[PDB]
Write a protein that binds this ligand. Structure first.
Ligand SMILES: [Zn+2]
Ligand SMILES: [Zn+2]
Ligand SMILES: [Zn+2]
Lengths: 50, 148, 97, 144, 148, 50
């Protein structure tokens, strides 16, 4: 906005190909992948005879 | 084969009853001319003060209204119509409210003006209109409004 | 935007006092409504306004020193200011001697 | 007792009196007193006056519109203008911080609960939490 | 089932004791109105001079305070409250400090004002308040403050 | 932001593609991976007969 010589200007994280919180969502995926894989090792793989 | 008549949201004119309801804590809804429709409330507890909310819907388990302190003016109440929030609702935004003078075509091809005394609804949600001096209830399309 | 960049200010409208002399057309020296000035004022209205270019222009003359300067302001929407309206900014203090 | 004050409790009574058109007196904090009034005629709206003295041939009140807030009315004290008393000549006002000594010679603070006088003009004061009366000298005006 | 009373950080009013403590080298903490809270110290060794630090915490093995030379003013000390850094702490930022006049509701539904003479704490960290003329200790929520 | 002849401009590390602390997190990962791979050699792999 430019009003009577005043000027206010903002550029957000929102973009045509990235969402506003998608920076955090991506980081949460990187966090879950480390956490989730490490926890499946505690329970282990399933097996059934045939 | 119909639904019983639906009451219109009576506007409140007397300031005294408005203040009494407010002191009782019952919610009020104020139709501001310039900046839309707002809710007005008295703060609970000892620290009495007026509060406003624009969370303009009936309170619900999934939708809880947020109240901001505001210095509501007497003149605002007087000049603006106010309704009880228990009544004013989207249920029936009838085109021709009760006590409204409307123009209706009679069987003799002579247009007459009558005041709507009773309004009801049916299964389809239609608006049946009762006019003074006649028993048959008219429909929305048949009627007409005259303004000024 | 205006509420953000502005400063809290009291807006009081102006109107000619009834105390004006009907024949000369000039005001009474002292009355409650206006203190000698020929223009009275209404009750104030709290308002946010933006202000720019504030100048304390000093003119030194034979009558003495005099403070006069230009300050450019920008209001909110729907507000219709009138000539010789008055504003006062409690927040900002000015030194004088 | 003294008849110098008759504050209104309910705002509903205040609005009822305003409908009747009687003037009101509304106190302020470290600020001038105010008179409030309902405008006559077709349009109803609140009006205020910074003047306080009674109307006379030599003194007339000035009224202007103002968006009076119900918060002021409910919070601040309110009186009928005609029946208000200017001053009660006592050292301490009502609802004022004061200091005293209890029956066991223990010092304690309190606010004035009631202002009283005898027929001879001697003034007695009752404090909060103290049923007995206190002399003007026995009290002490606490500094803010 | 509680913890013993906690002393409040006594402000120091007399300049003479302030200067004596400073000459002894004990640290002082100055609450500047405009630019926050600072520490004041006398330099050790022969080259005597006043020093300031904004390393505003108790000294610790892992957190060593850094001292800058400054020309501290007498007027600054006089007009600004000063505390001994051994006392002033985050431990108890009580809403109603000692000697403060507070408003409390009595059992007879009559609000009275009393000065807090003693304050203590319990397992949960609550703030029990002692008021003159009464033995029972009140709680934070019950009380109220009156200002000006 | 420009007001009355004084102007300021700031550009944060925030972006649509990466969050403001993403650089610190990504360096933490680079250290943790080295730190964790090296430490696994202190314990070693797991074996079970069958
Ligand atoms: Zn299994
Ligand atoms: Zn005049
Ligand atoms: Zn192993």
């Amino acid at each position: 906005l430019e009003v009577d010589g005043i000027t206010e200007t903002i550029g957000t994280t929102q973009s045509a190909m990235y969402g506003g919180a998608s920076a955090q969502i991506l980081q949460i995926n990187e966090d879950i992948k480390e956490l989730l894989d490490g926890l499946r090792a505690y329970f282990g793989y399933n097996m059934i005879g045939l | 084969i119909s639904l019983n008549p639906i009451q219109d949201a009576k506007p409140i004119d007397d300031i005294v009853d408005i203040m009494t309801y407010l002191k009782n804590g019952k919610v009020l809804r104020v139709k501001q001319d310039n900046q839309g429709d707002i809710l007005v409330r008295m703060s609970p507890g000892k620290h009495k003060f007026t509060e406003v909310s624009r969370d303009l819907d009936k309170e619900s388990f999934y939708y809880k209204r947020h109240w901001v302190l505001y210095n509501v003016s007497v003149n605002s109440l007087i000049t603006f119509d106010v309704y009880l929030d228990e009544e004013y609702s989207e249920t029936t935004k009838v085109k021709y409210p009760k006590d409204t003078i409307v123009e209706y075509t009679r069987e003799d091809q002579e247009k007459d003006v009558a005041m709507i005394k009773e309004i009801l609804t049916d299964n389809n949600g239609n608006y049946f209109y009762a006019l003074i001096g006649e028993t048959m209830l008219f429909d929305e399309n048949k009627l007409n409004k005259v303004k000024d | 935007f205006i509420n953000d960049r502005g400063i809290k200010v009291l807006w009081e409208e102006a109107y000619f006092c009834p105390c004006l002399n009907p024949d000369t057309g000039h005001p009474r020296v002292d009355c409650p409504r206006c203190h000698g000035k020929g223009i009275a004022y209404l009750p104030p209205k709290e308002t946010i306004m933006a202000i720019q270019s504030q100048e304390k222009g000093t003119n030194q003359l034979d009558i003495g020193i005099l403070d006069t300067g230009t300050a450019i302001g920008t209001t909110q929407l729907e507000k219709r200011i009138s000539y010789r309206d008055r504003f006062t900014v409690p927040e900002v203090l000015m030194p004088q001697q």
